[PDB]
Structures are given as C-alpha cells and as structure tokens.
Structure 1
Amino acid sequence: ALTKSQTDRLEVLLNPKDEISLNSGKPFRELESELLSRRKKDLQQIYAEERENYLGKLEREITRFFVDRGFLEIKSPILIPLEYIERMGIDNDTELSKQIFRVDKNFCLRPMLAPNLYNYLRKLDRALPDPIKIFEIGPCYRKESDGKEHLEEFTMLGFQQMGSGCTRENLESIITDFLNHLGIDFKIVGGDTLDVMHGDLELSSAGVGPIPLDREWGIDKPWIGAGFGLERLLKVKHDFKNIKRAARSESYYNGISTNL
C-alpha cells in the first residue's frame, strides 16, 4: 500500500507518456528511483538537443503565425493604470474587479490585453491602411481560486482586426487556421460572443464589434478579436493534468519536475 503522500510524490514525477502503473506491487522507494532516472534523462535530452522553453517557443511560433498573416506585433505595458479596468466596464458587480492585483495607488498588473489593444487600434488608425491587424502576447495576472485550469500569473495572446473584413466568418476562420496549425482540437460555441472550447476547458473568448464599450476607447469601426491562454494551449497539447506544469515556474521545466 502506497500512502496518499508517496502517490502525490510519484505523480509529480510522472509524465503523461509514462507507462508505469502507480497501483502495482513495487515499493515506493523503487518506483521513485525509476521515475527520478527517467526525468533526469528527459532533462539531459532537452539540454543536449534543443534547449528551448515550451512557453517561449510557443510564443515565438504564435508570433510567426500572426506576423505572417499580416498582424502587427505589439509589446505594451504589463503594469497599467488602474483607470483602464474601470473604463473596460469592470465594476464591483462583475467578478474580475475582485481579481485585480493592485500596485501602488493608481496601477495594477493587467488582467487582460484589451485596454492596450484598444489604445493601439485608435492610434494606428491614424497612420495605417484599412484593415488594422494587431496582436500581443505576454503576461497577465488575475487572483484565482486554486484550480487545475487557472494560474494567477499566465500568458495571453490577444489579436484584433478593425475596419473591413470584420465578420464572424473571418473570425472563425482565423481561429480555425490557428488551432489546426498548432494541432489543438477545439469546438467553437456561440455585441456577438464566441467561446473556443476543448471539452470543458475554455481556450479562448472571442468577440465581434462594434459594441457600446468601444466609444469610451475612441473606437467607432467594426472589429473582431480573441484572447487565448498559452498555458492552456500547452496543457492540452501535452496532456498535462494540471496547468501548473505549463506555467512560469521554478517547479517544472517543460512539464518535467525540477525537484529531483
């Protein structure tokens, strides 16, 4: 009989592709030594042969996809004015107001990319030809209850197109090409809203404008856009049972435990 604590320890060391039954007769000590050897070899193979981090590599692959498709790569501030949250319509009744990491008196860690993308669309509308296509990838922050699908520090991809061609059909085509390119199974389920699901897991929320909120941001053109969590994409792709395996972490490297 393995104790529940010895099983938690072995499950840290287990990778989805492992073919080992934790319930078989071998003693903890031996099963731990086997898995430690495997995970050490896994890290050695990464270090010898490719050396790229899953989250960095995914960001670079997504970047090439969107640049190639005519979207401008944005890198905007992560620490943003608290006033942006209110101007997004996030009042006390909405659940997100309680999820904000505040910094100082007038700043917060951004929980979303939409504010900065709105500001860029408005400013670039002055210099760039129709349609304006932009995207950003980077850290976002939300206070969350413990969950196998939520991190407090995560990474989001946001893209938005404004002007002509901003139809639901074009939006679904971008999403569909994107996820088939990455090899991620999905279903699209549906101010017009749209969620991109993998089973019960939300990969993305997507939107079609105009919506009344646009006016506060100086936007008055149709638009389409979506936001995706990179760690959720990694979790699906690598079949991780807990999203912590995909996070920025000192505890996991490319889903391999670092506590060996």
Structure 2
Amino acid sequence: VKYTDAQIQRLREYGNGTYEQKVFEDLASRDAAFSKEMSVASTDNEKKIKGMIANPSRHGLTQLMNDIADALVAEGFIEVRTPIFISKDALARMTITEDKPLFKQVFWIDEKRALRPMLAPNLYSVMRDLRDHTDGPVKIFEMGSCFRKELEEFTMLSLCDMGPRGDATEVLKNYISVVMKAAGLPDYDLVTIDVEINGQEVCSAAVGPDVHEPTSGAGFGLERLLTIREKYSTVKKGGASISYLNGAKIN
C-alpha cells in the first residue's frame, strides 16, 4: 500500500522527502504515517523559512551560477550575456521552423521576435564574431533565462568553443566534468551526448554540428541540477518563484 497520488502531492507541497517509495500494509497505517509526515514537513518548512530570514544568504540558484561560472573562467572561458529577445530569422537558422516541434513552444513577442528558448543562437553569433579578433580558440559561456511553453522559465548554462581541438569529444567531456564538479554533482552518467543522473537528463552536449570551424557545446538546466543536489521534491522550489524560496514554501 502506498501513499495516494493526492497524498504525495500534499506531502510535496511543504516537504522535500522521498514519499513515493514508502509502502504500508494497511489504509490505517498509511493514513497514520501520512498525518505524521505532513506535520513534520510543515514544521520543518516553517523552521527553514524562519532561518533564512534570520540568516540571509545568496540565493541558491545565484550561488550555483557563481560556483560554476568561476570554474569556467578558470578554465579560460569568457562569460557573455546576451538578450532574451531573439529574431524569428535567428530561430530559423537554428532550424526551429514552423515544422519543428520546438517552434510551437516558442513565446512570440511580436511578428519577428521571440523569447529565446535556448542560448545557442546568440552564443553562436558572439563566438563567431570573437573569432574575427584572434588566431586562437574561443571559449565562452552564458547563464540566463530561457522560455518554452509547457518550467516555462528556466535557467540554462550554455558553453561553447570554436577552433582547433585535439580530440573534440574528450575535450567536451572534460568541460562537462568541470561544470558537474563545480555544481557539487560529481557522480553522473553520459548517454551527441547527454548527461543523466538516475535517468534524469540535466545536460545535452554535442561536438561539431559554407566552411565552418570545429565547434562543440553543452547546455545544462541549472534548476534541475539544484533540485537534484538539494533533494527538493519538485523542480519548482529552487529557482525563481513567488511561492518558494530556496526550497521552502513561503505561503
């Protein structure tokens, strides 16, 4: 006997335990355990919010962004910031056309512009222009909000490099290692390449997608990383919200 779907939802509202795994042998014992775990979840949540107010910290998502960013700069990556608005033409050069399914997920701002659903269009542009100014490899990254109709707003970390690279795949796997280790998630699986933790995809990366330079890139979902690391019971608690703050429900 397990918690009902409704009970799971109620437990996850204020609690960050792993309630789906629990089994009982009696509706009566399920119900008694549920009552106790709901009370513990709620009191634990209240104590946690009372603690943040009393000892404020950098936001958990901001802290994670800083930890990863300082690691990438030490690896030689330039941090860039690009606009949230992108053009329809930019999406089309990404092959996101009325045909592709991602297109139907795009938030349009007007007839010619959209909220970016990924960071790559802008980063490709910046990377290519930076290469106009140097003979060497160019390595950049951005962290920022992306938007898709479904989290509808999520924070992507995208890194990319252009230029000569001995063993592109090995180099890309090392970039992934730098990020994951800096994020506090050193244990993960690789599946052009996907990063999974217990089957949950947290990164998609690839080597080398009219003359072009060698290029590779990796995109991480930072709320997903934070959720896994802090063992929050939903992906809606660690990022931007007016209901949650650093894992705790404020209302």
> SS of 1:112's equivalent?
coil
Q: Corresponding residue for 1:23?
A: 30
The superposition leaves residues 193-226 of structure 1 with CA deviations (integer Å, 9 ceiling, x where unpaired) of: 11111122111111111x3xxx5xxx72101111
Distance 2:184 2:85 in 1: 33
Match of 2:48 in 1: 42
- Which of 226, 239, 244 is matched with 1:234 structurally? 226
Structure 1: which 5+ residue stretches go unaligned? 145-150
The list of structure 1 runs, each at least 4 consecutive aligned residues, that deviate by more than 4 angstroms after superposition, is: 2-7, 30-34
CA displacement at 1:27 relative to structure 2: 8.4
Q: Which amino acid aligns with 2:165?
A: G
Partner of 1:23, secondary structure, is helix
Partner SS state of residue 25, structure 1: helix
* Pairing 1:164–2:164 present: yes
> What is the number of residues matched between the two proteins?
239
User: Does the CA-based 8 Å contact 2:116-2:146 persist in structure 1?
Assistant: yes
Residue 198 of structure 2 corresponds to: 199
TM norm structure 2 = 0.85
Q: Distance in 2 between matches of 1:227 and 1:195?
A: 10
User: Which digits, 9 at most, give the CA deviation of each residue in 1:3-54, with x for residues without a partner?
Assistant: 9756633431112389xx89352785x8655543321211122233342211
Q: Is the 8 A contact 1:130 1:162 kept in 2?
A: no
2:231 maps to amino acid = D
**SS of residue paired to 1:241:** coil
Aligned position for 2:247: 255
CA 1:78/1:187 → structure 2, altered by over 3 Å: closer, same or farther?
A: same
- Separation in 1 of the partners of 2:200 and 2:158? 18
- The aligned counterpart of 1:115 is 121
In structure 2, the residue matched to 1:176 is 177
Higher mean displacement: 126-135 or 116-125: 126-135
For structure 2, the 5+ residue unaligned runs are 23-28
User: Could you tell me which residue of structure 1 aligns to residue 70 of structure 2?
Assistant: 64
Whether the aligned pair in 1 keeps the contact of 2:158 and 2:217 (CA below 8 Å) is yes
Match of 1:54 in 2: 60
CA distance in structure 1 between the aligned counterparts of 2:250 and 2:89, rounded to whole angstroms = 40
Letter in 2 for 1:175: I
Report the aligned-residue RMSD.
Answer: 2.5
Percent of counterpart pairs with the same letter? Answer: 38
2: CA distance between counterparts of 1:5 and 1:201?
23
1:148 corresponds to? none
